[PDB]
Amino acid sequence: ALLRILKETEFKKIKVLGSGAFGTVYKGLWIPAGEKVKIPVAIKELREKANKAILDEAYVMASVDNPHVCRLLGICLTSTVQLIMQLMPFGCLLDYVREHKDNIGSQYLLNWCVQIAKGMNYLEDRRLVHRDLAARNVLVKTPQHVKITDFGLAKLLVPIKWMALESILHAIYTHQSDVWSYGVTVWELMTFGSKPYDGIPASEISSILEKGERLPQPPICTIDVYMIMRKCWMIDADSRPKFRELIIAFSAMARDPQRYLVIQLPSPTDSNFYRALMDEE
Amino acid sequence: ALLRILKETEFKKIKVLGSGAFGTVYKGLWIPAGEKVKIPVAIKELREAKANKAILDEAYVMASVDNPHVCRLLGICLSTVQLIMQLMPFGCLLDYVREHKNIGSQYLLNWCVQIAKGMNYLEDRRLVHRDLAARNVLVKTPQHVKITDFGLAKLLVPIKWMALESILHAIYTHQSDVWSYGVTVWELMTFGSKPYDGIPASEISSILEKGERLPQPPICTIDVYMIMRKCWMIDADSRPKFRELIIAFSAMARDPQRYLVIQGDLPSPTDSNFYRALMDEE
Ligand SMILES: CSc1nc(-c2cccc(NC(=O)c3c(F)cccc3F)c2)c(-c2ccnc(NC(C)=O)c2)[nH]1
Ligand SMILES: CSc1nc(-c2cccc(NC(=O)c3c(F)cccc3F)c2)c(-c2ccnc(NC(C)=O)c2)[nH]1
């Protein structure tokens, strides 16, 4: 009821928007049968499991209801699998911070951390494990609104530099390892999209973590934010913070952003403009 | 606070969509400052009429409406007055009914209900549309319609839509909006027929005085036609109030096949949820 199965004849891929490990992303047009309208959408043709299993996980993916979690809207099952969701012209968060390296404000970064924590806490409440949280898997509806996508794709279909030690060593994935990946994502945002452990071979990461080394303190970060990152990267999974707690912490910091980030928001009207044209959510 | 004043630099007209009385409509792009994104928008360049503040003050009123069945003006640019609003791919209801001449009684009755709701809202905010008509009703989804362009007439002639008092003394009230509502219902029930086809507008006042009105639509039972006829009474105070129209049509919509007769006379929860997730999160 929440997942619309689509025929091939009712939609069309128009241009390629990007790619990821799980597949290719297109701008498409949905033509509602019996109408003459073209409605833009985002289509992910997954790369190369029984059909009943694919469909069951697509239902799970389509049952989420949270302002910061993307919901799968439609699926097309043929020789390939095509996922359909709302088209968001702003793209993914990693690309955006890289494009706005010299103008992003501290309010946005703290608010993005808050929103990602809300999405993650929601998924934990639904007993869902993302397995690949990262700045590239967070989409921008509006500069003030971000949404996590693609949870569960990893299990159905390896980002070593984002994974917890337990995941690299014993292929264990939990909400706590998602917290580790959250720490890495916050690090990505605070560095304006820097590559974690740039130039370091992935095969050394297990070693570097075992001797106690972690990603460096980001230049714009006071010790307050970096401590949260470090707690997300504790070897003992049960000692890392809970998403529910990170929301509060980052929200407090958002109440006074200039004190917690040191770098060299929309007016009420612009926000309603943005919301009326693209975010009635 | 509710009206964004725009600068010619933030947007662009890209395609012409149509013309009407108050102006020409284009599909356009808002390029938010600082960004590289082009966001689809709807622009209406208005025809000349009032100083710019007067315009803006009426634009502020037009921008303060908050009702699911009333279009809200979002932005304005003031060489030409350009109004901006969200782009709605389905266009106006009149063209929709003409293109699907394939429509069941439930859709028709629900459109009447939603239009009356929007009108009753405008009456509550003490605004008089002055040009209610199928052409001024836009379709967000086939299940969701919205009145637009209220107030645009005063700020800047649909004779076949106006009450006798409006034709004779340029008197406009909520009760004359009730008249135009009746004519709008007639357009919908006839699948977009042109009211008083063939009768010169100059003679409309005469035929109305002699007691002649629009004919009963073939698909209409006497109940619906009686509602229309009551909307076209000479005594303004005897016509129905929008809040009463919302009830009767609502009731009729609860048993649609008893009040409209369509040969071969409904969206699934799945498809409804889809439309809403792509185009109507309201
Ligand atoms: C990683 S990169 C990326 N993937 C997508 C995409 C597209 C279609 C479907 C899903 N994913 C799902 O449906 C989905 C899933 F697979 C599991 C759980 C929940 C879900 F919702 C992702 C986008 C994207 C999306 C919208 N708009 C834009 N706009 C621009 C300009 O890029 C880009 N980007
Ligand atoms: C003559 S018909 C018509 N006019 C408009 C239009 C465009 C921009 C602004 C306003 N109106 C206002 O700003 C406004 C006002 F002037 C007074 C009170 C409240 C208001 F909101 C109307 C459309 C339209 C709109 C969106 N999408 C589509 N899509 C397609 C395919 O046409 C068509 N159609």
Residue numbers in the entry:
A (entry chain C): 702 to 749, 754 to 862, 876 to 982, 989 to 1005
B (entry chain D): 702 to 750, 754 to 782, 784 to 806, 808 to 862, 876 to 984, 989 to 1005
Give the article text.
The epidermal growth factor receptor (EGFR) tyrosine kinase is an important therapeutic target in non‐small cell lung cancer (NSCLC).
The aminopyridine interacts as previously observed with the backbone of M793 at the hinge region, and the imidazole moiety is engaged in an H‐bond with catalytic lysine (K745). Accordingly, this group binds through a π‐stacking interaction with the side chain of F856 of the DFG motif. The binding mode of inhibitor 6 is practically analogous to that of proximal Type V inhibitor LN5461 and the allosteric inhibitor EAI045, indicating that the back pocket groups share interactions with these earlier examples of EGFR inhibitors. Specifically, the back pocket binding group is attached to C‐4 of the linking ring in lapatinib, while for 6, the point of connection is at C‐3.
